[PDB]
Symmetry: C3
Subunit: 36 residues, 3 copies
Amino acid sequence: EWEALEKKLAAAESKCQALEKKLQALEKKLEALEHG
Amino acid sequence: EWEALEKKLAAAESKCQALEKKLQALEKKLEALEHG
Amino acid sequence: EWEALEKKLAAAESKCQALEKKLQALEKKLEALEHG
Ligand SMILES: [Zn+2]
Ligand SMILES: [Zn+2]
Ligand SMILES: [Zn+2]
Ligand SMILES: [Zn+2]
């Protein structure tokens, strides 16, 4: 249905934003190793 | 069209789930370096 | 609205593709550490 598509998109947007944060945290740890 | 939007969302959900797995695998390698 | 859903999906697709690239760049740095 239409409303179910709405909510699926919103969930995918939120999951991608959580993955962006998780990658930023990994990048921080990697850079500590790379320069230390 | 409507059905093409349906299938695009499903593909984006699946691609994001593959990226979540890929990040988990990287995190595993990073943690090995970080503590070894 | 319908057209706003269209554009939101397209933005989410593009953001996920940018995250895929960012993860590939991190993987490259991690592999340099892992084998060097
Ligand atoms: Zn660096
Ligand atoms: Zn994503
Ligand atoms: Zn650790
Ligand atoms: Zn390796």
